[PDB]
């Protein structure tokens, strides 16, 4: 049966709430039928004011509140309406949540989930389109995941709620209404995706292509165009930004001898910069028949005009182009 990414996250939170009374959800409009991007729809009706909690527009404050409640032993899901807005609360995420178990010598855990859409949307311009994967992924003490499809999002949100540390879940607003066929094993309330493990979405022999979030589907579309020419791409869905699954990536490159990384966020000091650096530092460097290359968003604040916006995010054609450049074809 088909389930939208939005509905998968909602299943995951519903189940995690039902399963543990210490789990609660808080953020702007989470209790309202419409309702941010409608991801929490129905939850308030089922769980009430105690557990589904609308906040004022006070990001630093309600994120700090969420962190203290986790310190006190509760298990908050803190929704940022978009991650752009997390910047107002970022010291709470980094200095109060991430660093605390370490600084306390293992005494004070912080079982908090920060979630909400990250990166590009459609026509919302420069202040509402920023990708925070590299920023968060840089930080010791955080875990950072970036689901692409319905399975990714249900299983990572469930793992995130069960983790006993600060997990940043970077969702995607364009992905919410996208339907995917949902296997019985994903339907189960038992379904978890381990944090720190990539998924090979498509097996291949000629090139390793690694992505996260929505560009993953663009990577799969590029692959289908490419096989018609006898080029087999191995497509890897990172899932986790920190700790990323580099061994899965290296194994693949040792088989295919080529690598393109694909991301939506800005290129410099971005996710592909790390993957590239690790490839060059580890065992897979000697298996490269060509340098690795990066597909990214354009290195601009996001423009509004549609044509400009379309050309500020990686397209299937940009991926194919990069891949042919690397295979020299």
């Amino acid at each position: 049966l088909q389930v939208t990414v939005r509905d998968a996250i909602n299943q995951g939170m519903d189940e995690e709430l039902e399963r543990d009374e210490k789990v609660f959800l808080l953020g702007e409009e989470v209790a309202q039928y419409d309702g941010a991007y409608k991801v929490s729809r129905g939850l308030w009706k089922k769980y009430g004011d105690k557990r589904i909690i609308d906040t004022p527009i006070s990001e630093m404050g309600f994120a700090g509140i969420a962190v203290g409640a986790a310190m006190a032993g509760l298990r908050p899901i803190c929704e940022f309406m978009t991650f752009n807005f997390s910047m107002q609360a970022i010291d709470q995420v980094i200095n109060s949540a991430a660093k605390t178990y370490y600084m306390s010598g293992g005494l004070q855990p912080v079982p908090i989930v920060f979630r909400g859409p990250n990166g590009a949307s459609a026509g919302v311009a420069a202040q509402h389109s920023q990708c925070f994967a590299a920023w968060y992924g840089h930080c010791p003490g955080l875990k950072v995941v970036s689901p692409w499809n319905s399975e990714d999002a249900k299983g990572l949100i469930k793992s995130a709620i069960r983790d006993n540390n600060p997990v940043v879940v970077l969702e995607n607003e364009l992905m919410y209404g996208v339907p995917f066929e949902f296997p019985p094993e994903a339907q189960s309330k038992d379904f978890l995706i381990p944090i720190g493990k990539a998924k090979i979405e498509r097996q291949g022999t000629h090139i390793t292509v690694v992505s996260h979030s929505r560009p993953v589907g663009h990577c799969l579309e590029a692959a289908a165009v490419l096989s018609k020419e006898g080029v087999e791409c191995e497509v890897i869905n990172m899932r986790t930004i920190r700790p990323m699954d580099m061994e899965t990536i290296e194994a693949s490159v040792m088989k295919t001898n080529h690598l393109v990384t694909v991301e939506g966020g800005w290129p410099q000091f971005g996710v592909g910069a790390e993957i590239c650096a690790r490839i060059m530092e580890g065992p897979a460097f000697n298996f490269l028949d060509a340098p690795a290359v990066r597909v990214t968003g354009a290195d601009v604040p996001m423009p509004y005009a549609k044509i400009l916006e379309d050309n500020s995010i990686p397209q299937v054609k940009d991926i194919i182009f990069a891949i042919k450049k690397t295979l020299n074809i």
Partner: protein, 332 residues
């Protein structure tokens, strides 16, 4: 024959109106409860509000047509504010607000064309389609800011420049009741008070004692449905800051129509006729149609200017696109 001015007309030149008294916070004496309207000003305010009103209805049409994308925040119903405010200040004064800015872009001097064309994302928009609904700038108008609450410390900093520059200009810093709990707003109140900044902090309250939230900073609560009330409160507030007394809060209450209120005032006191006002309406409609036609016919900006205007006053340089083979020229 020349013995009477060609512009001589049939009407009263001015009339005196009662305006609602403002609730006061830490002020002994508020704005006056009467004001004089001139025929000329009334016709001006009436045309301006009516233009904002038709512009915003038009924007909504285009938005429903999917020609405008992303956000499209409208100020229809609130025209007594942007027009009232404009009427109590000088062009050399400064104004910033959040994203519900189409009206202020107009009252601060951008044409309906530039405003709609930015909304529809075309090269003739006031930012060549780079910004869309939320980010429009104009002369001593500083947006058009999409992060709720962020504009209030910006406003206080523009006011610090006013004080720094010594030219007796003031800054009007607007925020909505939705943002009134932002902590950076209270940071700005405190620094504004400490430094006696000429900052009029304005809460646009759409429909909770906001004018008192500056605590030590004095406040007034104003009828934001009455252009004359807004005009006098503004004059009072601006004159307050200009005297060196520091910041002040103004809560504008909105929810009866502000255009109709002015219309009835003008007709009943014979400042203008029903017919004059209808002809203004007719001209306003033409202005909005020409603007909407241009906004929808105008082409998108060209792809080769994608990377333009990253930095001011720099040599040109290249920015990377979605891969290293895509390079965009950036020119200041």
């Amino acid at each position: 024959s020349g013995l009477v001015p060609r512009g001589s007309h049939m009407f009263a030149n001015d009339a005196t109106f009662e305006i609602k008294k403002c609730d006061l916070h830490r002020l002994e004496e508020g704005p006056p409860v009467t004001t004089v309207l001139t025929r000329e000003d009334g016709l001006k305010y009436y045309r301006m509000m009516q233009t904002v009103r038709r512009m915003e209805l038009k924007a909504d049409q285009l938005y429903k047509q999917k020609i405008i994308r992303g956000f499209c925040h409208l100020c229809d119903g609130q025209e007594a504010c942007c027009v009232g405010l404009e009427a109590g200040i000088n062009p050399t004064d400064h104004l910033i607000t959040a994203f519900r800015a189409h009206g202020f872009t107009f009252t601060r001097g951008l044409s309906v064309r530039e405003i709609l064309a930015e909304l529809t994302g075309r090269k003739g928009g006031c930012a060549k389609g780079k910004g869309g609904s939320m980010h429009m700038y104009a002369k001593n108008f500083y947006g058009g800011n999409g992060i709720v609450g962020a504009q209030v410390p910006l406003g206080a900093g523009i006011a610090l420049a006013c004080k720094y520059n010594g030219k007796d200009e003031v800054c009007l810093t607007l925020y909505g009741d939705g943002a009134a709990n932002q902590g950076q707003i209270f940071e700005a109140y405190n620094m504004a008070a400490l430094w006696k900044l000429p900052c009029i902090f304005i809460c646009e309250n759409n429909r909770t004692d906001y004018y008192k939230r500056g605590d030590f900073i004095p406040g007034l609560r104003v009828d934001g449905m009455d252009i004359l009330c807004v005009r006098e409160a503004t004059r009072f507030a601006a004159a307050y800051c200009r005297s060196g007394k520091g910041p002040i809060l103004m809560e504008l209450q909105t929810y009866s129509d502000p255009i109709m209120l002015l219309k009835d005032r003008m007709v009943n006191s014979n400042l203008a006729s029903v017919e004059e006002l209808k002809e203004i309406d007719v001209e306003v409609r033409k202005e909005i149609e020409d603007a909407a036609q241009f906004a929808t016919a105008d082409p998108e900006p060209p792809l080769e200017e994608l990377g333009y205007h990253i930095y001011s006053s720099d040599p040109p340089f290249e920015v990377r696109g979605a891969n290293q083979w895509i390079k965009f020229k950036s020119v200041s």
